[PDB]
Design a protein around this motif. Structure first.
Motif, mmCIF file in Angstrom:
data_model
loop_
_atom_site.group_PDB
_atom_site.id
_atom_site.type_symbol
_atom_site.label_atom_id
_atom_site.label_comp_id
_atom_site.label_asym_id
_atom_site.label_seq_id
_atom_site.Cartn_x
_atom_site.Cartn_y
_atom_site.Cartn_z
ATOM 1 N N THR B 27 0.628 -1.174 0.237
ATOM 2 C CA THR B 27 -0.306 0.142 0.153
ATOM 3 C C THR B 27 1.363 1.313 -0.075
ATOM 4 O OG1 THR B 27 -1.525 -1.108 1.226
ATOM 5 C CG2 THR B 27 -1.900 1.287 1.237
ATOM 6 N N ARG B 33 -1.037 19.043 -1.436
ATOM 7 C CA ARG B 33 -1.859 20.397 -0.968
ATOM 8 C C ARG B 33 -2.323 21.602 -1.792
ATOM 9 N NH1 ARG B 33 -1.308 21.568 4.429
ATOM 10 N NH2 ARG B 33 0.459 19.578 4.848
ATOM 11 N N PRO B 35 -3.774 24.942 -0.849
ATOM 12 C CA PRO B 35 -3.917 26.436 -0.497
ATOM 13 C C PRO B 35 -5.127 27.158 -1.259
ATOM 14 C CG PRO B 35 -2.205 26.463 -0.590
ATOM 15 C CD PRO B 35 -1.599 24.970 -1.184
ATOM 16 N N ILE B 36 -6.115 28.003 -0.432
ATOM 17 C CA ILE B 36 -6.336 28.614 -1.078
ATOM 18 C C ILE B 36 -6.171 30.508 -1.419
ATOM 19 C CG2 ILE B 36 -8.927 29.927 -0.917
ATOM 20 C CD1 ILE B 36 -9.586 26.891 0.642
ATOM 21 N N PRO B 37 -5.878 31.094 -1.182
ATOM 22 C CA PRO B 37 -5.341 32.395 -1.632
ATOM 23 C C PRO B 37 -7.036 32.778 -1.589
ATOM 24 C CG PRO B 37 -5.412 31.587 -3.922
ATOM 25 C CD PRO B 37 -6.329 29.995 -3.100
ATOM 26 N N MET B 38 -6.301 34.374 -0.756
ATOM 27 C CA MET B 38 -7.339 36.034 -0.596
ATOM 28 C C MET B 38 -7.047 36.271 -1.735
ATOM 29 S SD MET B 38 -8.062 38.022 2.043
ATOM 30 C CE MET B 38 -8.587 37.170 3.683
#
Lengths: 37, 49
Positions: B27, B33, B35-38
């Motif tokens: 396995t 990843r 990440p959300i920007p502004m």
């Protein structure tokens, strides 16, 4: 820290992987029908 | 010289004992990843009164 914007505590989503395949594929089954011995 | 001189058999062992491991199966997992920007604002000014 004037700006405290999340950097590490992200949502974790798990993608499923387990499968219950049906002996030989339907392609092979139509050609070689299974007989239980 | 018409004769059979040798042969080969399609013989295999019966692995009642674990003589052979065969192929391995393990396995693994990968991580991605995101990440959300502004984004830049849009403003609607109003008179404060």
């Amino acid at each position: 820290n004037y700006n405290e914007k999340s950097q590490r505590d992200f949502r974790v989503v798990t993608i499923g992987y387990n499968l219950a395949a049906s002996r030989q594929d339907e392609f092979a089954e139509r050609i070689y029908p299974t007989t239980v011995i | 010289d018409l004769a059979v001189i040798g042969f080969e058999l399609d013989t295999r062992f019966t692995n009642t004992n674990r003589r052979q491991r065969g192929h391995l199966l393990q396995t693994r997992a990968l991580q991605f990843r995101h990440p959300i920007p502004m984004h830049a604002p849009v403003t609607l000014p109003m008179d404060t009164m």
